[PDB]
Amino acid sequence: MVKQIESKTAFQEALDAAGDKLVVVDFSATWCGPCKMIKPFFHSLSEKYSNVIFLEVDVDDCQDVASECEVKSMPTFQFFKKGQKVGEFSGANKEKLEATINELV
Amino acid sequence: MVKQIESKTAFQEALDAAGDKLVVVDFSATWCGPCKMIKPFFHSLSEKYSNVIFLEVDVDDCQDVASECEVKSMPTFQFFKKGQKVGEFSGANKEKLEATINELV
């Protein structure tokens, strides 16, 4: 299920502990409408794909992580495999989220 | 020069007091890179076009205004004439900002 990130150290330690597994990070903001609309579906994906790690970073909480990951739209999903970014898109598109997970797993 | 908005009442009162003038609102976030990159140029435009009102809304400060204006990218520029939205785009594009101001003034 979804891991809540509350520091840059925790973000890095998570990308390390993932090993060979795909990591999907949702960068979101609480005030932003599309973020709220997609949160339940992002949590259902985490129950459906045991083999993929799902992280949530609130950009207001972790402005340093947000800045460093160069986020500028919400939600933004970034995909990582062994510390490397292998995909990214923004917008609350359900079909695209899952289709990207299936391409990258 | 640029007016700092710190409430929804102040945002509404500003759109009222503008009368027939174009209002350009920059929705930004302090942590976001492109926002910081374009801030000086947005302030130079405000000195150059006396006849246009330039407002700044920090989306962390005025999450209600941000939500209601349905912002989801930073920076987002929204353009208003007599309380009505007449244009919008996002991204730190200098030429486009000024070209839109000249189309709408």
Curated annotation (Swiss-Prot), chains A, B:
GO cellular component: cytoplasm; cytosol; extracellular exosome; extracellular region; nucleoplasm; nucleus
Modification note: In case of infection, ubiquitinated by S.typhimurium protein slrP, leading to its degradation.
Positions where S-nitrosocysteine occurs in the chain: C62, C69, S73
Record PTM N6-acetyllysine, positions in chain: K3, K39, K94
Substitution effect: D60N: Loss of pH-dependence of dimerization
Record-marked site positions (Deprotonates C-terminal active site Cys): D26
Superkingdom of the source species: Eukaryota
Site entry (Contributes to redox potential value), positions: G33, P34
Domain Thioredoxin as annotated: residue spans: 2-105
GO biological process: cell redox homeostasis; cellular detoxification of hydrogen peroxide; negative regulation of protein export from nucleus; negative regulation of transcription by RNA polymerase II; positive regulation of DNA binding; positive regulation of peptidyl-cysteine S-nitrosylation; positive regulation of phosphatidylinositol 3-kinase/protein kinase B signal transduction; response to nitric oxide
InterPro entries: Thioredoxin (IPR005746), Thioredoxin-like_sf (IPR036249), Thioredoxin_CS (IPR017937), Thioredoxin_domain (IPR013766)
A single GO molecular function term of this UniProt record: thioredoxin-disulfide reductase (NADPH) activity
Classification via SUPFAM superfamilies: Thioredoxin-like
Annotated family: Belongs to the thioredoxin family.
Function per UniProt: Participates in various redox reactions through the reversible oxidation of its active center dithiol to a disulfide and catalyzes dithiol-disulfide exchange reactions. Plays a role in the reversible S-nitrosylation of cysteine residues in target proteins, and thereby contributes to the response to intracellular nitric oxide. Nitrosylates the active site Cys of CASP3 in response to nitric oxide (NO), and thereby inhibits caspase-3 activity.
The protein's name: Thioredoxin
Organism (species): Homo sapiens
